[PDB]
């Protein structure tokens, strides 16, 4: 449930600082369910939901630990360096799974016509599409920024503050 994802997101917050407490909140996460076929796909939909908040805005693990996660100003012009910080944040996030976590769980299934063997391909896929973002942030010119403004306005309206 939402309480479990929001408890792992708070144990990643402490994983940047020290491991001992966060290793007991992974040992208490062997008070889990343990049936492979869908409840390990229920801590999958947790590790996936945090790899979608680390590419998003300020990730919801932030607040308690003010690491490289911090609520960076969205009125800043530091868009590229701010997103480099998030490929690093998603890199220490894959490491703080590898040492104490994600040694299982794989719900990729079918997404947008794509079949994928394992949820761990979604970490690699969110990494590849966070390298794509920095590449088109490196290339910023008036034709591409116009083609972007049209795309964004087609998907939804934008706040004009």
């Amino acid at each position: 449930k939402t309480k479990h994802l929001k408890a792992a997101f708070l144990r990643y917050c402490r994983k940047d600082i020290l491991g001992a407490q966060s290793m007991v909140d992974s040992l208490f996460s062997d008070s889990d369910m343990e049936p492979d076929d869908e409840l390990d796909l229920a801590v999958n939909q947790i590790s996936v939901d945090l790899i979608d908040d680390y590419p998003a805005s300020d990730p919801r693990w932030a607040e308690s630990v003010p690491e490289e996660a911090a609520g960076f100003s969205n009125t800043s012009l530091i868009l590229l360096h701010q997103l480099e910080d998030k490929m690093k944040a998603h890199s220490f996030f894959v490491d703080f799974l590898h040492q104490v976590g994600l040694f299982s769980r794989l719900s990729t299934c079918q997404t947008k016509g794509m079949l994928v063997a394992t949820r761990l391909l979604l970490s690699e896929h969110a990494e590849k599409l966070s390298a794509a973002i920095v590449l088109k942030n490196h290339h910023a010119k008036l034709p591409v920024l116009v083609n972007s403004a049209i795309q964004l306005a087609l998907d939804k309206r934008m706040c004009t503050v």
Partner: protein, 801 residues
């Protein structure tokens, strides 16, 4: 309004173990009731009594000040029934009424030595004691008493269980009698007011007897309350059958006697109130009815109307000649709506106090306890009645149907449940409100059997936030805003950045609105439409100044916490702070000019003729085209010249066309404040010189009001004297121990007038650095004009050869 609650401000302040033991030793006598009250005097005392034991404590600290154990003539110990503070001859003590098996004794107890100093045997069981006066003799202070009582030295009223009302002479002039309670003097009781009291008193004193005037014969009804009302000069006597009487101490007559509307219930307390404004010299007396066995408690407000109101030589006001006394308000405390179902409630009065401020504020405080059968915890309440609000409410006779005490405009009500929750085993004896209605705040102390307890009675989304932020700027509560800014800058939450932006945009919007209002007020000061500043416009200008200062402090807090601002945001914030600071300074100077005649034509003619005189004297030899004031103005460049040419008749030169053009110099950016004050001081000196005939001009306060250094003051006086042709005093002011262009102009001016000796004196003392070929030629000319050829020759070789 539905639950005002008392807040406990400290822990229980326990009495010393010795006081608690002394009060418990007599609980072994099953008939000994522990009593306690606060003293009504200025001495901050509380007293507790159990059987023969009396304990006196500090009403704030609970510390034992004094104690006594009374001895009786019989094998049964006396009971302390009545205690009142009495101050005489710079001593502080208590009048103590003791009940014995065969009678009663009135004791005078001196707290400073912890002993009885006088004792008097009473005819019957004492129920209450009340001091009328603490001194004797033919003074101005005793003139309000009957001619009989003026021969007594200290007068105390004493009442008995059989209805006696006795006025006892304390014989405070007799320094040789130290009597204890066992060597008590007999009483000479007089039933008829005698014409020859001095001879009777001297006979009684010689027999070791106290003289007594009997006001009331024994009726067989107990007197349950006694109080002396100094403002009406009446002794209030309440009876156990619900009768109430007023005895006039000037005439020794009963002016009033009635049964109160609550019927055959004992009158237990009285409280006097004076209204701020009554057209017929009315004052008020509360009479409280309560049963000792527990029962109904009712409050009755008596209106006393008097034909005359005399100021005594003490400045105190005395009401004389009672016309009528009538009941005007009743309130049943036992009958009021707290009992869902007919449970027998036992209601007890704890305290009755009046607090008057000079009265503009007259309030009566009633405290009572309600014990519902089967609830182990008592409910304690404090009620405050405001007589001036009851007047405004059109003098209602009772609570109107569907009005509750909780929603009364002239009565406020606090729950003491927070006090009871700490004091679950303790008996509350009394409640004192500290003199120093739902909007009133006050501190109070409860008296317990274990100690004291202190408590305070407090009085009763973006647009809501803007109203709170406005209130914080308007009350100068900048500590709230600065603490919120500091925390939202430390909390890296995305909501904190939105709040900081909102407060910054709001702060700047408030500065803009305060400026528009300030300009609207200032426009009337300068257009000549206003001959007098109303106190209101002066207060509105003060309020605008306070708002600019308060908003400048908020902007300075943003600058101090702004570690991560964009280069543009740092410039914008610094510009906003600079503008708000200049507006604060301008508003302060405008307000000072309002709190503090300018003849433009006379001063302009004078300075025009001095400039023409200087031009004629210079003969084109010197660059003396300017006065010292013109040099001071030229430091601001063309800005002052543009400002002073804006107004009709503006020459763009000194003096300014009007006072508005002078004051607008304070609105100039990037000018030093001391240079602005220097122009204003130079201008105030011209005004003072125009009016020699008034030494006490508020104009002399300017340098003190703006913290102008005494050093700059003397320098500007020196420049003013120079332009006024007083060169000796000018140089004495400038040379007092307390610019480059000024050196050249002083030397050229002294040379143009032929005073080469003063030019040499100036050059020798100040030693100005000659940087230009013109300055070196000037210095050579000073030296040559004084025949110092060798020095001039050496100066030429040193500097261009």
């Amino acid at each position: 309004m539905q639950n005002l609650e008392a807040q406990v401000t400290g822990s229980l302040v326990a009495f010393p173990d010795v006081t608690q033991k002394a009060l418990k030793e007599d609980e072994i006598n099953l008939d000994s009731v522990l009593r306690g009250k606060f003293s009504t005097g200025r001495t901050s005392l509380a007293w507790l009594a159990c059987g023969p034991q009396l304990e006196i404590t500090n009403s704030v600290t609970g510390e034992r000040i004094s104690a006594y154990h009374f001895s009786g003539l019989t094998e049964r110990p006396p009971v302390v029934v009545a205690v009142k503070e009495f101050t005489w001859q710079k001593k502080t003590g208590l009048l103590v009424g003791l009940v014995e098996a065969e009678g009663s004794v009135l004791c005078l107890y001196d707290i400073g030595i912890s002993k009885v100093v006088k004792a008097v045997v009473l005819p019957g069981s004492v129920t209450a004691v009340e001091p009328i006066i603490n001194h004797g003799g033919a003074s101005a202070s005793t003139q309000h008493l009957h001619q009989s009582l003026r021969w007594f030295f200290g007068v105390t009223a004493v009442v008995t269980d059989v209805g006696h009302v006795l006025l006892i002479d304390l014989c405070l002039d007799e320094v040789s009698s130290n009597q204890d309670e066992l060597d008590a003097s007999d009483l000479e009781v007089m039933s008829v007011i005698p014409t020859k009291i001095p001879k009777l008193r001297e006979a009684a004193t010689r027999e070791r007897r106290h003289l007594c005037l009997q006001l009331a014969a024994p009726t067989g009804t107990t007197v349950s309350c006694l109080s002396y009302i100094s403002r009406t000069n009446q002794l209030a006597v309440g009876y156990s059958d619900g009768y109430f009487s007023l005895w006039n101490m000037k005439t020794l007559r009963r002016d009033y006697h009635v049964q109160i509307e609550g019927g055959r219930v004992p009158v237990c307390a009285v409280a006097f109130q004076e209204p701020e404004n009554d057209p017929r010299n009315c004052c008020y007396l509360w009479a409280v009815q309560s049963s000792e066995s527990g029962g109904d408690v009712s409050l009755h407000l008596l209106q006393l109307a008097f034909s005359d109101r005399k100021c005594l030589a003490s400045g105190q006001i005395m009401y004389e000649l009672l016309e009528y006394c009538e009941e005007r308000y009743s309130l049943d405390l036992s009958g009021s709506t707290l009992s869902l179902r007919g449970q027998s409630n036992n209601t007890k009065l704890l305290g009755c106090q009046t607090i008057e401020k000079f009265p503009d504020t007259s309030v009566s405080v009633f405290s009572w306890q309600v014990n519902t059968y089967g609830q182990g915890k008592p409910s304690v309440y404090l009620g405050v009645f405001d007589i001036n609000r009851w007047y405004q409410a059109q003098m209602p006779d009772s609570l109107r149907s569907g009005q509750f005490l909780r929603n009364c405009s002239y009565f406020a009500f606090w729950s003491l449940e927070a006090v009871v929750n700490i004091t679950t085993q303790d008996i509350i004896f009394d409640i004192l409100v500290h003199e120093r209605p739902s909007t009133y705040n006050f501190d109070a102390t409860c008296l317990l059997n274990s100690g004291l307890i202190h408590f305070a009675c407090t009085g009763f989304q973006e647009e809501q936030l803007q109203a709170i932020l406005a209130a914080a700027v308007e009350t100068s509560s900048l500590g709230l805003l600065t603490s919120c800014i500091k925390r939202w800058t430390a909390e890296e939450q995305p909501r904190s950045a939105a709040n900081l932006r909102f407060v910054l945009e709001w702060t700047w919007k408030k500065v803009t609105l305060t400026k528009q209002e300030f300009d609207r007020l200032c426009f009337r000061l300068f257009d000549g439409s206003c001959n007098f500043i109303d106190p209101h416009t002066l207060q509105s200008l003060q309020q605008c100044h306070l708002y600019f200062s308060n908003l400048t402090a908020v902007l300075n807090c943003f600058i101090a916490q702004a570690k991560e601002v964009t280069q543009q945001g740092a410039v914008d914030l610094t510009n906003k702070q600079s503008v708000t600071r200049l507006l604060t300074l301008y508003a302060s100077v405008v307000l000072w000019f309002c709190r503090s005649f300018y003849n433009y034509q006379v001063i302009q003619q004078y300075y025009s003729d001095q400039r023409k005189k200087l031009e004629r004297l210079a003969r084109g030899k010197w660059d003396t085209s300017s006065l010292m004031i013109d040099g001071l103005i030229n430091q601001f460049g063309d800005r002052i010249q543009q400002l002073w040419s804006r107004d009709d008749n503006g020459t763009g030169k000194y003096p300014p066309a009007n006072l508005h053009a002078l004051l607008d110099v304070y609105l100039l950016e990037n000018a030093d404040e001391m240079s602005k004050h220097a122009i204003t001081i130079y201008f105030l000196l011209d005004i003072m010189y125009s009016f020699p005939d008034k030494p006490d001009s508020s104009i002399e306060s300017f340098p003190t009001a703006f913290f102008v250094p005494g050093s700059l003051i003397k320098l500007i006086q020196g420049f003013w004297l120079l332009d006024h042709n007083d060169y000796q005093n000018s140089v004495d002011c400038i040379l007092n121990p307390a610019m480059s262009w000024q050196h050249s102009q002083i030397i050229e001016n002294l040379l143009c007038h032929g005073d080469s000796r003063q030019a040499l004196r100036y050059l020798q003392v100040m030693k100005p650095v000659a940087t230009t070929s013109k300055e070196v030629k000037l210095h050579m000319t000073v030296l040559l004009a004084n025949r110092s050829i060798l020095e001039a020759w050496n100066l030429q070789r040193l500097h261009n050869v």
